[PDB]
Amino acid sequence: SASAVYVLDLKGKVLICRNYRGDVDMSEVEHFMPILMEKEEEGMLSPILAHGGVRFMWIKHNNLYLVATSKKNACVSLVFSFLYKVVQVFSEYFKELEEESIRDNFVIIYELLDELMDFGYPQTTDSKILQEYITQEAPRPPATVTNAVSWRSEGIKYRKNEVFLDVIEAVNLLVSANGNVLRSEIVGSIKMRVFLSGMPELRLGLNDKVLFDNTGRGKSKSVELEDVKFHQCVRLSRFENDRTISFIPPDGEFELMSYRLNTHVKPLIWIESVIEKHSHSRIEYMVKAKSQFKRRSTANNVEIHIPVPNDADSPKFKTTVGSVKWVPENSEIVWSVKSFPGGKEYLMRAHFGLPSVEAEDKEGKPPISVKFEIPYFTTSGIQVRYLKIIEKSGYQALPWVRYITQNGDYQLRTQ
Amino acid sequence: EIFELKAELNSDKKEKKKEAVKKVIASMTVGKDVSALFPDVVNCMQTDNLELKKLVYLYLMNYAKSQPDMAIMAVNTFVKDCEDPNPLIRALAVRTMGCIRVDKITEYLCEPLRKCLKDEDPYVRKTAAVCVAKLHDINAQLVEDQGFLDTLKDLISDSNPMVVANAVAALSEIAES
Amino acid sequence: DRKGGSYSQAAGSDSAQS
Amino acid sequence: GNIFANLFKGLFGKKEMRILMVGLDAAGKTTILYKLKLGEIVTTIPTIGFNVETVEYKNISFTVWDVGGQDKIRPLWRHYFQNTQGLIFVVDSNDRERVNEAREELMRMLAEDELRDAVLLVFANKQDLPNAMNAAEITDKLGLHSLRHRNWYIQATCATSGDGLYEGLDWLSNQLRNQK
Ligand SMILES: Nc1nc2c(ncn2[C@@H]2O[C@H](COP(=O)(O)OP(=O)(O)OP(=O)(O)O)[C@@H](O)[C@H]2O)c(=O)[nH]1
Ligand SMILES: [Mg+2]
Structure with a gap:
């Protein structure tokens, strides 16, 4: 329930503002800087400020803080999600997030801000879908937003059908100064760059422990992901029914699924x-x-x-x-x-x-x-089993995927 | 400066009108009190290019409470724009109508809101649902008189899941107050 | 080649599970 | 300086000109503008704001800016007086009680020191009912001959039919353009 979405700077100057409800005066932004300075100098600084009856909940960006004023009991989580979506859209449209583009890309920035949220309620957040209706260099809005599939524009055609996957591992280890590891969590990341013709319905299949147990093969190397978070394209009902990961891959690189399970093995x-x-x-x-x-x-x-x-x-x-x-x-x-x-x-x-x-x-x-x-090292042992790429026209896909192992929150406590 | 900008905005050349609109937008964003030129930009509003129409609508929305008297010269333009074949233009007009915090302007916007409530375009339906909630927040009595509650209730039981979600959110906001 | 592990082709489904 | 480009442009037509559309509400201004632009009698709601259109005839872009006759819009006619070259007055002969108000509004608008080069253009609208007067009774009642330094021309145009629009356009072109 944000009242006015504004973009500040490091000197306290508001780079751009976009009121959504108008219930909060635009002059309240001036007191945000002194309030933030007082909170930081006293240790009470938080991303959610409060100027009397108006709350200033915002996060700090690379160069400016995207502060969104609110007065009623608005959902802080919704405001944070909207801010994250706006940051992602800005990153997708502008390669850099600094004051150089705020004062230079205002023509498209204002249009994007107006179209994204109306009356404090956002409606569109897909950068790829939004790029077909608001450009900085206008036709009718695409039917993808109106249709159920708002993350895969229809009519996409390519010379080849190649999808590149990335099984990125995050080795996070919290070793205390005594030599024992306290927090040792490994979070999987299945990031795929789907580039095909049409709107294929990907059917992801892996050697999940739950899937192996359900099929009766719960005796081989099965990945035991404590938390599995599918993307928007992945159907929650299909996964909840019989662990069927069926979704329409988007056009470009996106995070489809992100496994997160604890690790009980010795440190690498x-x-x-x-x-x-x-x-x-x-x-x-x-x-x-x-x-x-x-x-x-x-x-x-x-x-x-x-x-x-x-x-x-x-x-x-x-x-x-x-x-x-x-x-x-x-x-x-x-x-x-x-x-x-x-x-x-x-x-x-x-x-x-x-x-x-x-x-x-x-x-x-x-x-x-x-x-x-x-x-080329999968610590969790999870291996991709199949990827059902089905298209109405009918084509032979050439999916690809690579496994990358890195160190995440692998910090060692000092003595 | 101000005189030159007014002369450029009151010209018949679109190449100068677009530059004047961009300069006015930058001055307002740069922190310049450009509300004194609101009547001058009122004449240069009905433009075929959507690039200048959006800037004019944004300036009017940002200069609506400051000069409510000068905003009486936009009801006809909004009514004309509420019937454009392009769904984007209709959605922009609906959003601008609800964003104008004018007591004497929301009264005449009931007819366009009623016309756009049953719009076939899902974007138009979402824009109408948002405008109904904005009008109800601005004037609950006007929304109740217009009988938009029945239309909003039927929105949830229709197609366009995004439009249905928008209508549900608008109904929740109206019931919240 | 590519740093972080060479890309490998993926299957279509669990052929051993019908 | 060289004016070869101007001469080349004028060899095939360069002048466009402007025009104004003012008058009382429900006086056929919107319908007259629609007929001039499109050629059909379109029924429209009362002009709360204003309507701006253009007419292409005789190689001159006759831009007409329709102005409503609302009480709150009567004092807004001074906004169109800036950068205005023409002016068309639409009378309402079917409203005897509104005839005095229209005459007073025309006199008030004609008493401006900035609107001096705009020639008079009297249009006899609603020329379909027997109660409508002739082209001289309305002018005599309004005293169009008493406008010193004003070129007034009364033209009767039927909203339903459209007769007399060509004559009025020709008269306006002759008054604005002083060439062959
Ligand atoms: N039937 C008929 N009606 C006419 C005729 N001439 C004028 N009218 C009336 O004049 C009105 C013209 O209104 P519009 O054409 O929409 O524009 P307007 O004359 O500026 O009126 P406002 O918008 O209220 O200022 C119509 O509603 C008619 O009722 C005519 O020749 N025949
Ligand atoms: Mg009219």
Whole structure:
């Protein structure tokens, strides 16, 4: 129930505003900046502000905060979803989200803002569908919005029918300073770039544990996804009935399904780091990385971030494999490794100075984060079984998919 | 500046009219009080190009409460635009009619709202459903007199699931107040 | 080639499940 | 400077001209404009706002801006006085009580120091009922001959039939254009 959607800037100037109900005066945006400054300076700053009887719930973008004023008991979740959809639409239309396009793409921005939401109730959010009715360089609105299928424009024709899939893995590990892993969750991501002719009805089929149990094959390697979130094209009823993943793929790259299940296996990389920090004299970093992953897999672009002292200067690194550099902007040791074969063991011996004068205030212990990304490795063991591409005209599809394993929330708590 | 902009907007050349409309939109967005030129832009409203019509409608909506007296010169234009063959033009006109916070303007908009309530185009139906809720929020008595509750109730039991959802949301908003 | 694992062709359905 | 392009444009017709459409409500202004533009008697609701159209005849774009006769729209006729070259007055001979009001409105509109180059164009609308007067009784009642420095021409046009529209257009073209 947003009253006026406005786009602010880093200096407090509203780049663009679009009132939806008009029940809130446009002058309330001026008090948002002082209120945000007071909240940030007192630790009470939150994305949902409140100027008396008017609430300013908005998120911070790359360069400006998309603040949407509201006065009644509007749905905060609905406002957040609308803001996320607007951000996605802006990213799809404009390659950059900065003030350079706000003051240059106002002609199409105003039209998009007017068409997207009316009276505070959004109606269209598909960038691909919206690109056929509002352009910055107008015909009747497409029937896709009026029809049930609002995410697949009819009449799409291509020379070839190739669909590229991406089974991206997110290895998130929360290892405490005692050496035990607390939060170890792996979230699957099935992102597909469907490029076919017509409006095919994809029938996704994988070796799901539930599907195998229902079919009676609950004895082989089956993926046990605790949470499975299908896209808008995926029919919820079909999945709820008999685990049938039937949906119309969109034209382009989109997230069809996103599995999310816990992981009870050992970490693919084991980091043994020590801190021999002398009292204002020197420091030692006996960091040893052990790869627990399969030897057939190589972790391309391994970046184990080791937080070094903030005031440390004149550091020396005695490592074994990979380039180690200290970035003063981040104040940490970047253990950058290009290719890390599975089972490899890298040992490092850091040595940096420390000023005699102690710091005025404590700086904390940032967690050690690894940036391992090993492609062609499915840690969860989930493999795509089939993809039923059916078209009324009739064509031979050539679906493709790749498995990518990377490190997600793989942070290591410091001692 | 202001005189030059008014002269450009009061010209018979569309190439200058579009530039003047863009400059007026930028000045309003840049933070310039351009409400004094509302009567001047009123004459340059009935334009075939949809690019200038949308900007004029946005300026009128943003300059409707500021100059309600000068907004009396747009009812005929809205009535004429509410019958355009293009569904987009009709939807834009319906949205602009409900966005105008004028007490003396919403009274005459009941007929276009009634005409567009049973529009075959799903976009037109959604625009009419939104405009009915906007009018009810602006004036509940006018909406009740127009008898839009019966039309809104029948909207949920019709085709166009997006239009049905919009009508349900409008009915919930009306019942909320 | 492509970083992150080479793309592999996908099947049409569970041929072993009829 | 060179005026070769202007001469080339004028060799095949360059002048367009303008026109105005004012008068009392229900005076045949909208129907007259529709007949001039399309050629049919279209029934329309009272002109709450205004109607702008153009007529292409004799290589001159005769743009006509219909103005309603509403009480709240009577003082809005001064908006069209800016960048206006012509003016057409539509009388209502079927409304005896409204004849005085129409004459007063015409006198008020004709008493403006900015609207001086606009020649008079009296159109006898509703020329289908026996109660309608001739082309001189209405002019005598309105005193069109007493308008100093004003070129007035009374033309009777039937809304249902359309007779006299060509004569009025020819008279307007002759008054506006002073060439061969
Ligand atoms: N039947 C008939 N009616 C006429 C004739 N001439 C004028 N009228 C009346 O004049 C009215 C003309 O209204 P419109 O053509 O819509 O435009 P208008 O004359 O400017 O009237 P307003 O819009 O109210 O200002 C019609 O409603 C008719 O009732 C005619 O020749 N025959
Ligand atoms: Mg008329």
